[PDB]
mmCIF file of C-alpha atoms in Angstrom:
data_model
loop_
_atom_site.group_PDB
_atom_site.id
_atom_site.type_symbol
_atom_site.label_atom_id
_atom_site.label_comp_id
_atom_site.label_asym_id
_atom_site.label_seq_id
_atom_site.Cartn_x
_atom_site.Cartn_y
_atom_site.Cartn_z
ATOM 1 C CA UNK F 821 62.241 -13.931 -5.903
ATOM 2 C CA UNK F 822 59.357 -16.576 -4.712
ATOM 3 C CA UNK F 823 58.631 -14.753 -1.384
ATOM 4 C CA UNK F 824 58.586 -11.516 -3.402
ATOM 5 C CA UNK F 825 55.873 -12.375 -5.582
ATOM 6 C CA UNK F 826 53.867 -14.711 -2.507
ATOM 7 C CA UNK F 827 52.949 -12.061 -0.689
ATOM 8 C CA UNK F 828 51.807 -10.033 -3.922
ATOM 9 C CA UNK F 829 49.757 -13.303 -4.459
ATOM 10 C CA UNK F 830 48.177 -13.818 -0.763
ATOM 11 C CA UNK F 831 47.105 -9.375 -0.689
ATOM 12 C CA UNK F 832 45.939 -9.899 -3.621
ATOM 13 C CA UNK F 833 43.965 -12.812 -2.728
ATOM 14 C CA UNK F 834 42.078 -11.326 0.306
ATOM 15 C CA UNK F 835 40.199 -8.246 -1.998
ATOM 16 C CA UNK F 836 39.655 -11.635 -4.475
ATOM 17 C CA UNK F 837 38.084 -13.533 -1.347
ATOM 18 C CA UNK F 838 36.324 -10.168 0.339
ATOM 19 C CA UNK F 839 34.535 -9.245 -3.075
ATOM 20 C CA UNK F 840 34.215 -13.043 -3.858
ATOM 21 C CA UNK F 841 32.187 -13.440 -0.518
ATOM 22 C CA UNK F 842 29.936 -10.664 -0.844
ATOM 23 C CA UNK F 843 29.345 -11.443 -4.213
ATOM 24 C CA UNK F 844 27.989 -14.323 -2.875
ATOM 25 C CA UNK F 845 26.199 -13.295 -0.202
ATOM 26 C CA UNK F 846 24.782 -10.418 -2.038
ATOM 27 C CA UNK F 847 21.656 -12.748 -3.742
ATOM 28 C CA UNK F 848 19.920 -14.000 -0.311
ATOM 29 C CA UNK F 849 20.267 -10.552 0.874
ATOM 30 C CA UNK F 850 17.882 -8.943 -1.933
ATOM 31 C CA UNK F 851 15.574 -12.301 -1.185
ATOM 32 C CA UNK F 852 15.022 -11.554 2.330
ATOM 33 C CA UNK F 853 14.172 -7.508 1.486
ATOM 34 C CA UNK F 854 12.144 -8.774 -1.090
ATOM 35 C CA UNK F 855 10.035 -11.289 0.631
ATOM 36 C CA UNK F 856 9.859 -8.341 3.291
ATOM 37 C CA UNK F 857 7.388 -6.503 1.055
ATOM 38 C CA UNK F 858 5.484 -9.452 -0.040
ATOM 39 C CA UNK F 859 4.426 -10.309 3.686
ATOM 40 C CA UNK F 860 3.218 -6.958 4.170
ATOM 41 C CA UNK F 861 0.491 -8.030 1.473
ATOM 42 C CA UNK F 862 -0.001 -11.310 2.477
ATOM 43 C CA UNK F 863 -1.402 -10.673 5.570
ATOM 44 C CA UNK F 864 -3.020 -7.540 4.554
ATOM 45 C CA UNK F 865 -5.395 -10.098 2.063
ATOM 46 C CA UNK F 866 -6.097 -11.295 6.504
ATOM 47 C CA UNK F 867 -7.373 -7.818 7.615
ATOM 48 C CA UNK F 868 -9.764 -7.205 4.268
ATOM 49 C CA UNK F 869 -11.013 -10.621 4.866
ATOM 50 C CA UNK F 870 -12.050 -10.080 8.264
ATOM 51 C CA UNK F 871 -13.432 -6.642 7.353
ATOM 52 C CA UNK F 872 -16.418 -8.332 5.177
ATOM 53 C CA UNK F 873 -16.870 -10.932 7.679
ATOM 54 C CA UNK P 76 -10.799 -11.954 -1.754
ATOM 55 C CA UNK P 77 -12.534 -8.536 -0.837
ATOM 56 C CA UNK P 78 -15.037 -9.682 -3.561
ATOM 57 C CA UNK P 79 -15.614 -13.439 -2.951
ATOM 58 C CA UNK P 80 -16.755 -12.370 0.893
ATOM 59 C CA UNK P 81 -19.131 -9.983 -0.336
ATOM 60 C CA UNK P 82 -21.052 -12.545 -2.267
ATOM 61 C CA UNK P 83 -21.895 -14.335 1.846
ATOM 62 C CA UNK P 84 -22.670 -10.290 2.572
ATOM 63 C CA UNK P 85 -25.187 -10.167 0.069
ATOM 64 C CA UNK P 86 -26.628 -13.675 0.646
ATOM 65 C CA UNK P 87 -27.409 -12.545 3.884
ATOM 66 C CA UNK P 88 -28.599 -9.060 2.659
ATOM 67 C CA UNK P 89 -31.270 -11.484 0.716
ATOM 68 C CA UNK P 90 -31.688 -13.898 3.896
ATOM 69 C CA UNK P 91 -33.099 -11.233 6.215
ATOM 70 C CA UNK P 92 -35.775 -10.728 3.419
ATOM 71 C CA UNK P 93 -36.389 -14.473 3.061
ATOM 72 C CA UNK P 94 -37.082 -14.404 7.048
ATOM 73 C CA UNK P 95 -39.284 -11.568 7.019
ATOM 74 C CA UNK P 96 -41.675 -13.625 5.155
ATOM 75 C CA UNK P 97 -40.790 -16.689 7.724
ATOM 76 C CA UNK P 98 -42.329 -14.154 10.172
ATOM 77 C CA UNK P 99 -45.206 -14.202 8.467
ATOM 78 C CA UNK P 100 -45.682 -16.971 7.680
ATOM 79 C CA UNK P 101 -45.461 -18.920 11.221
ATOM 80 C CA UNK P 102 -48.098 -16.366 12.158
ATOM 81 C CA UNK P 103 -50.474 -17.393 10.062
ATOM 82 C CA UNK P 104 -49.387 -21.193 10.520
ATOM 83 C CA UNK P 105 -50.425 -20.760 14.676
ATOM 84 C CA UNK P 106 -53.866 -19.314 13.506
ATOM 85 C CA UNK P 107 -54.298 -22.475 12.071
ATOM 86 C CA UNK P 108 -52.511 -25.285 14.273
ATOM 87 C CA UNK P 109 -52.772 -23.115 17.461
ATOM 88 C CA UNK P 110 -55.490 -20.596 17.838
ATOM 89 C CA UNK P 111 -58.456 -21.936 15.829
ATOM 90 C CA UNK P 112 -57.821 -26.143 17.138
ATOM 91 C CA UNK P 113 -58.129 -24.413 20.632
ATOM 92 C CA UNK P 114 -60.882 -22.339 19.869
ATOM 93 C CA UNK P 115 -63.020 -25.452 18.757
ATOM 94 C CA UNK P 116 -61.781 -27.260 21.517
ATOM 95 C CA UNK P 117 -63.041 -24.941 24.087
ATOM 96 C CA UNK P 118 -66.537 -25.343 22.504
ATOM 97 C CA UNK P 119 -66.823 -28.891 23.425
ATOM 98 C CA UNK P 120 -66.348 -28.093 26.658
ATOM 99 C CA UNK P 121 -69.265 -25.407 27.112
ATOM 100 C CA UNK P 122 -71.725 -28.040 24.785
ATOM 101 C CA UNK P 123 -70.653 -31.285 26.942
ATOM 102 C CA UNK P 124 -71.096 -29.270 30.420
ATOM 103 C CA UNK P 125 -74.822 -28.350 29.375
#
């Protein structure tokens, strides 16, 4: 009766840990596509600079 | 930024009209330090001789 509900418990517990780590992982991942786009701008301010001097 | 570099673009735009009186003005400076001192200088020289 323990083994039977153990292994229940440990499947059970790798979809808890899979969707825990991605859950987890899933903020920095946004950050980096977001700074991505800011970049482009900041050195674009680099390029219109130099084009009046 | 685009806007704070265009107020050097139009000092300049100003500066080349502050130098075009420079021009001028240094000409008019050598007529007076330069050409004329000579002038007078060169009239000594044909008075003294005699």
């Amino acid at each position: 009766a323990q083994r039977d509900y153990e292994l229940k418990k440990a499947a059970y517990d790798i979809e808890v840990n899979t969707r825990r780590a991605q859950a987890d992982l899933a903020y920095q991942l946004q950050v980096a596509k977001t700074k991505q786009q800011i970049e482009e701008q900041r050195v674009q301010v680099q390029v219109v600079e130099r084009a009046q001097q | 930024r685009q806007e704070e570099i265009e107020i050097e673009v139009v000092q300049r735009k100003k500066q080349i009209a502050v130098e075009a009186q420079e021009i001028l003005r240094t000409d008019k400076e050598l007529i007076a330090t330069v050409r004329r001192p000579a002038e007078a200088e060169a009239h000594r020289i044909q008075q003294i001789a005699e």
